[PDB]
Amino acid sequence: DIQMTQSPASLSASVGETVTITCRASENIYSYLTWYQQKQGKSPQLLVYNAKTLTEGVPSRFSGSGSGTQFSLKINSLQPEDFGGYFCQHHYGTPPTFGGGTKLEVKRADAAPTVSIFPPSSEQLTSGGASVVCFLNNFYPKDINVKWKIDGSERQNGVLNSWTDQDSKDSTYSMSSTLTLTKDEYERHNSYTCEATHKTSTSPIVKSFNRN
């Protein structure tokens, strides 16, 4: 098999900039390389084929180069559309292995998480379960750490997290942590705090609520 090694795993830049993705072949593949653009959820689209030739719709700002084992895609004068997924594929033989991919994200100014903790709903408590939700919306960078403390003691068992894709409007990220307990264990305690650590500040932005 021919191994396709793509780099960087993800590049962050702002509109107007010029980036360069790189695919390297395990062995000589002449000019048999294609570049695809894939936006989350949609099916990939052909950008460059035969290592240099641009396809129909592709705008002049896209250009490919290389041959043998070293190839590179270059997107000069970025645009809002140009943000998303990018991968390569060799076309010399079978199987035509694909590259690892590259996530092209927008770069902006750092931002703090708007923490909002919510207590278990009454409809859920009567159902026999209790779930404490904690949102952390519109921040940057993507990096973040959420910790739960039930009555001061740290809580790690029962927590389920979920992050979002960089927002296409404000270029910020978001995540939501959910601590789930049994209606029995939930009413045996008072305070449910949700501590959040970020690069926007040294002190964790904590938001809690008390059963009192």
Binding site: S31, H91, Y92, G93, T94, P96
Partner: peptide, 13 residues
Amino acid sequence: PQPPYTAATAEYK
């Protein structure tokens, strides 16, 4: 020139 080959015919280059 290095005319391309399909996936099925690369062994013939």
